[PDB]
Amino acid sequence: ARIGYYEIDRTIGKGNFAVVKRATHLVTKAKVAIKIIDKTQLDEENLKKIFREVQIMKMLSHPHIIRLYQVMETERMIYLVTEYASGGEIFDHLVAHGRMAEKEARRKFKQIVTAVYFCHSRNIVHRDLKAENLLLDANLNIKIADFGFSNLFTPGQLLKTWCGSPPYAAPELFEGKEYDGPKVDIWSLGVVLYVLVCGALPFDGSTLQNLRARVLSGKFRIPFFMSTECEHLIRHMLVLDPNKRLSMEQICKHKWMKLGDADPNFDRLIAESQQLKPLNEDVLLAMEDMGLDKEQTLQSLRSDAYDHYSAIYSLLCD
Amino acid sequence: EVQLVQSGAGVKKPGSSVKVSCKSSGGSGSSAVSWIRQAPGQGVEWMGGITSIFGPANYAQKFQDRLKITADKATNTVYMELSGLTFEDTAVYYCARVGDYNFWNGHYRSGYYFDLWGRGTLVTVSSVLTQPPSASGTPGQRVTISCSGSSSNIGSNTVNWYQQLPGTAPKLLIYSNTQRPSGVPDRFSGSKSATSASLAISGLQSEDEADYYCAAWDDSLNGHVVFGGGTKVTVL
Ligand SMILES: CNc1ncc2cc(-c3ccc(-c4ncccc4F)cc3Cl)c(=O)n(C[C@H]3OC[C@H](N)CO3)c2n1
């Protein structure tokens, strides 16, 4: 009913060896998602992959990525408090409203590439870019979730962990080849872009084997409602030879990307990922009004503690 | 008691769009409803619908450009929108539910049989499987309807048979090649041999005067359910 300073409400998912429950912070009144995991039911490999996901989450703080707030660990349990996405998955949006206009699709795609480019700047590949992993906030703003298959990478070297959902997997992962990290995400962005503008998969079938033959063929239909600039973009990301796919920077400079009205917010956000490198006094005053010491709020913020002090500040800021 | 309620008959002008709804009553969630249309005097053709767990929706190549299939899971409603209408889109639009949804993981190949059917919506716009066009027999005889496909559809998938009584929506008669749904008498038998399928109606009765269609999923491209041209069975 109440885990720490959070009051448990509806269950937003029950999967693998964990249960994600939507809960409210008792003091800040913020809407959060607490992934509850029993460390006494997981095999050693799965527990360590969960600990590695938390570290990767602590590195990825972006407006279009689900923000980790608090990590509460006991001797047998682990609770993972993260930002709650009100608008649900982008998959459930496409099922309910169909394909988006290239104006809506372009706006949401820019937010996805903004987070993917930021991942690859810190040398982190998501490796599971699905439309079910693209969550939406109250105003339908993209929020990349599920850094489950994500891992570090060295630019120029090849990865070998064959993971990723089949309808979005690149043909290298189907064949079981040592692939390049970012090109495997660029193929996933090719599938995601097509799903946003058509409301259907580029590659589909009755079974996984039918779908597998489809992805390996590289042939997909370009519809009448799809513009020439959009067709060129998708076609140059869904390429069988990875060495012939557009880079994350080429995707940003694509003619389709500059087709809307001038977007200075997008250019500023991708410029902050090539540069990488402010305490809200109104929040610190409210925390001191309650009783949360300023010295412990600052210590927990700089040491990446993700504790009661660190979480109350961040939740109060957002 | 589970039935598929459809929206009313519409008269549309050229270039306009039409939206047809399909509300499920009696149970409750997870359906896999598809949209199939039937031109006046012509056979039935699959337009699009839920065909796998992977994507939000699947469309036949012919309808992808003008069809938008949506679903309000909060009200058990499934919608269909066809834009850029012409007199050739004047047809009886049906919504039909796939019968084996309850078994859909990633490896199970669906039979793609239409368990339930809607009454049909009359849409009027202001201006693949080889089957014999007709079959006849005297009461008591046995008639056999041939249905030929290719290795991409019948060769690699199950065959279904539908009976469409004059003026009604089609009804599932045979599923999974040989299976007779509850109510279908043992007089009707289905069979399949490599890329061919057959329907035998033994002890032919006056009540058997209907159009019969064979249907099998085709693995070409994103996949589609292909229907036969239909066989009108008359009794003498
Ligand atoms: C619906 N709105 C919403 N908003 C936020 C979330 C956050 C998480 C979540 C919470 C914690 C961790 C996590 N796990 C291990 C270590 C460290 C971690 F932070 C990972 C995740 Cl994804 C979550 O699971 N769901 C359910 C949903 O996610 C995508 C999937 N496609 C369907 O289900 C969410 N839903």
Side-chain angles (χ1 to χ4, degrees), chain A residues 1 3-75 77-260 262-267 269-275 278-293 295-318, chain B residues 1-108 110-206 208-236:
Chain A
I3 305 300
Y5 277 91
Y6 297 94
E7 66 158 53
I8 278 61
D9 299 294
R10 60 165 247 187
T11 161
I12 66 176
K14 168 216 74 269
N16 40 74
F17 269 139
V19 175
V20 192
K21 275 179 161 304
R22 129 89 239 283
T24 308
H25 197 338
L26 289 167
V27 48
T28 79
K29 290 295 156 231
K31 306 270 292 270
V32 277
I34 293 79
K35 173 113 77 132
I36 306 140
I37 309 172
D38 190 353
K39 325 201 309 275
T40 71
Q41 302 297 312
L42 301 130
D43 50 277
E44 307 70 26
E45 160 171 344
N46 283 128
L47 228 197
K48 302 302 167 57
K49 283 162 130 236
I50 257 64
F51 288 138
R52 96 123 65 112
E53 177 174 353
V54 167
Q55 310 308 295
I56 273 171
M57 294 241 79
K58 290 185 193 174
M59 305 193 244
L60 307 168
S61 184
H62 195 259
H64 300 299
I65 299 180
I66 294 274
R67 196 64 215 105
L68 180 63
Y69 285 117
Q70 188 171 346
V71 169
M72 313 194 281
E73 188 181 346
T74 73
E75 232 84 302
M77 297 281 176
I78 220 286
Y79 306 97
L80 291 314
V81 183
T82 71
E83 89 178 283
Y84 177 78
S86 313
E89 314 174 354
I90 226 172
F91 185 91
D92 295 341
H93 183 95
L94 293 162
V95 170
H97 301 108
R99 62 167 144 111
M100 292 164 195
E102 294 182 52
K103 183 195 219 156
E104 318 168 12
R106 172 163 36 247
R107 189 205 95 126
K108 312 299 183 304
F109 193 61
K110 287 195 187 157
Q111 304 191 326
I112 306 171
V113 309
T114 247
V116 169
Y117 193 99
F118 164 77
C119 279
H120 303 179
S121 313
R122 336 278 118 176
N123 290 159
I124 284 170
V125 274
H126 190 236
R127 296 200 306 208
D128 204 13
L129 283 175
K130 289 200 288 160
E132 21 276 89
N133 282 356
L134 299 172
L135 305 182
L136 303 174
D137 84 3
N139 305 116
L140 304 174
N141 292 141
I142 268 297
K143 292 293 177 160
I144 300 183
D146 208 341
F147 285 82
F149 296 159
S150 85
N151 200 28
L152 262 42
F153 78 90
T154 302
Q157 65 82 224
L158 306 179
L159 295 171
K160 57 228 287 189
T161 296
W162 295 289
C163 64
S165 77
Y168 294 79
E172 307 93 65
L173 306 114
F174 276 113
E175 289 177 88
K177 293 170 157 177
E178 282 187 276
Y179 59 86
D180 177 37
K183 287 157 196 161
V184 155
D185 282 356
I186 279 150
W187 174 282
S188 301
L189 289 193
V191 183
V192 172
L193 186 56
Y194 186 104
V195 166
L196 292 174
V197 308
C198 312
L201 282 172
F203 310 101
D204 209 340
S206 88
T207 55
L208 227 164
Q209 303 103 255
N210 282 120
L211 208 211
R212 179 194 152 93
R214 287 289 300 118
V215 179
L216 294 172
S217 67
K219 276 293 125 277
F220 52 95
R221 183 186 150 83
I222 280 92
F224 183 74
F225 51 80
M226 183 178 293
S227 73
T228 75
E229 288 89 355
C230 184
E231 170 192 353
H232 184 93
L233 178 54
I234 300 183
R235 272 175 160 272
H236 283 88
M237 299 190 291
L238 291 184
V239 184
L240 296 174
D241 179 23
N243 302 342
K244 292 194 89 187
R245 285 165 200 174
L246 310 178
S247 53
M248 278 299 298
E249 247 272 26
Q250 278 174 321
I251 294 163
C252 319
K253 304 179 299 174
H254 198 270
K255 49 196 205 298
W256 192 69
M257 227 65 162
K258 320 182 252 226
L259 227 53
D263 195 356
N265 199 306
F266 170 74
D267 287 326
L269 259 179
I270 89 108
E272 289 166 358
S273 304
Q274 309 170 346
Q275 153 223 284
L279 300 142
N280 206 158
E281 208 73 7
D282 302 65
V283 175
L284 279 333
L285 245 142
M287 293 180 74
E288 202 64 34
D289 167 52
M290 291 172 335
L292 303 161
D293 179 46
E295 204 171 10
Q296 196 53 246
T297 306
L298 292 170
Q299 160 88 305
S300 57
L301 252 44
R302 55 174 107 105
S303 78
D304 267 29
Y306 293 76
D307 56 5
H308 181 79
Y309 286 83
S310 200
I312 285 163
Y313 177 90
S314 306
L315 291 169
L316 236 32
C317 292
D318 314 329
Chain B
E1 273 213 15
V2 190
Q3 67 176 119
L4 263 43
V5 184
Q6 296 198 215
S7 74
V11 187
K12 294 293 174 161
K13 75 130 182 72
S16 68
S17 53
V18 54
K19 192 178 293 180
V20 185
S21 85
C22 184
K23 172 122 167 48
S24 189
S25 308
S28 300
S30 269
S31 299
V33 179
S34 308
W35 290 98
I36 306 135
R37 85 187 185 184
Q38 184 179 39
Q42 308 307 317
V44 102
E45 86 206 275
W46 184 81
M47 301 168 63
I50 291 106
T51 62
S52 59
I53 194 182
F54 310 136
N58 192 224
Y59 306 89
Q61 281 219 342
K62 308 211 146 291
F63 295 88
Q64 187 180 110
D65 298 334
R66 301 178 303 115
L67 236 198
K68 270 188 180 246
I69 296 169
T70 62
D72 190 9
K73 305 216 179 289
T75 65
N76 303 354
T77 331
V78 155
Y79 314 87
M80 174 211 112
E81 188 190 0
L82 194 63
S83 74
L85 291 170
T86 45
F87 71 104
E88 311 255 24
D89 307 309
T90 301
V92 183
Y93 289 77
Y94 299 111
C95 61
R97 184 190 68 183
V98 184
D100 54 6
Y101 187 70
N102 13 309
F103 303 97
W104 287 18
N105 51 25
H107 312 74
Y108 168 74
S110 176
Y112 291 106
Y113 52 90
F114 295 110
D115 205 333
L116 245 178
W117 283 77
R119 254 66 169 182
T121 291
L122 302 172
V123 165
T124 179
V125 188
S126 73
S127 38
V128 187
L129 251 31
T130 285
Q131 227 177 318
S134 51
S136 74
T138 51
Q141 295 199 161
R142 172 232 197 88
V143 304
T144 67
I145 303 170
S146 168
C147 172
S148 49
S150 65
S151 45
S152 43
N153 43 47
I154 297 170
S156 302
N157 272 276
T158 77
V159 180
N160 308 303
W161 287 91
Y162 300 83
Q163 171 182 87
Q164 185 181 35
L165 279 169
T168 74
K171 205 201 71 175
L172 196 265
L173 190 77
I174 285 295
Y175 71 95
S176 282
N177 299 335
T178 62
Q179 303 290 119
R180 279 180 288 273
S182 175
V184 173
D186 56 359
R187 311 190 277 98
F188 295 89
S189 81
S191 75
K192 178 194 158 178
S193 168
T195 61
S196 319
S198 243
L199 174 74
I201 310 166
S202 308
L204 202 64
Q205 344 221 128
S206 317
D208 299 328
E209 227 146 18
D211 280 79
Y212 295 76
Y213 292 91
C214 62
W217 173 266
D218 190 317
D219 293 311
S220 296
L221 283 146
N222 282 9
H224 50 293
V225 24
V226 301
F227 284 99
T231 292
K232 216 272 207 133
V233 176
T234 61
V235 182
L236 304 327

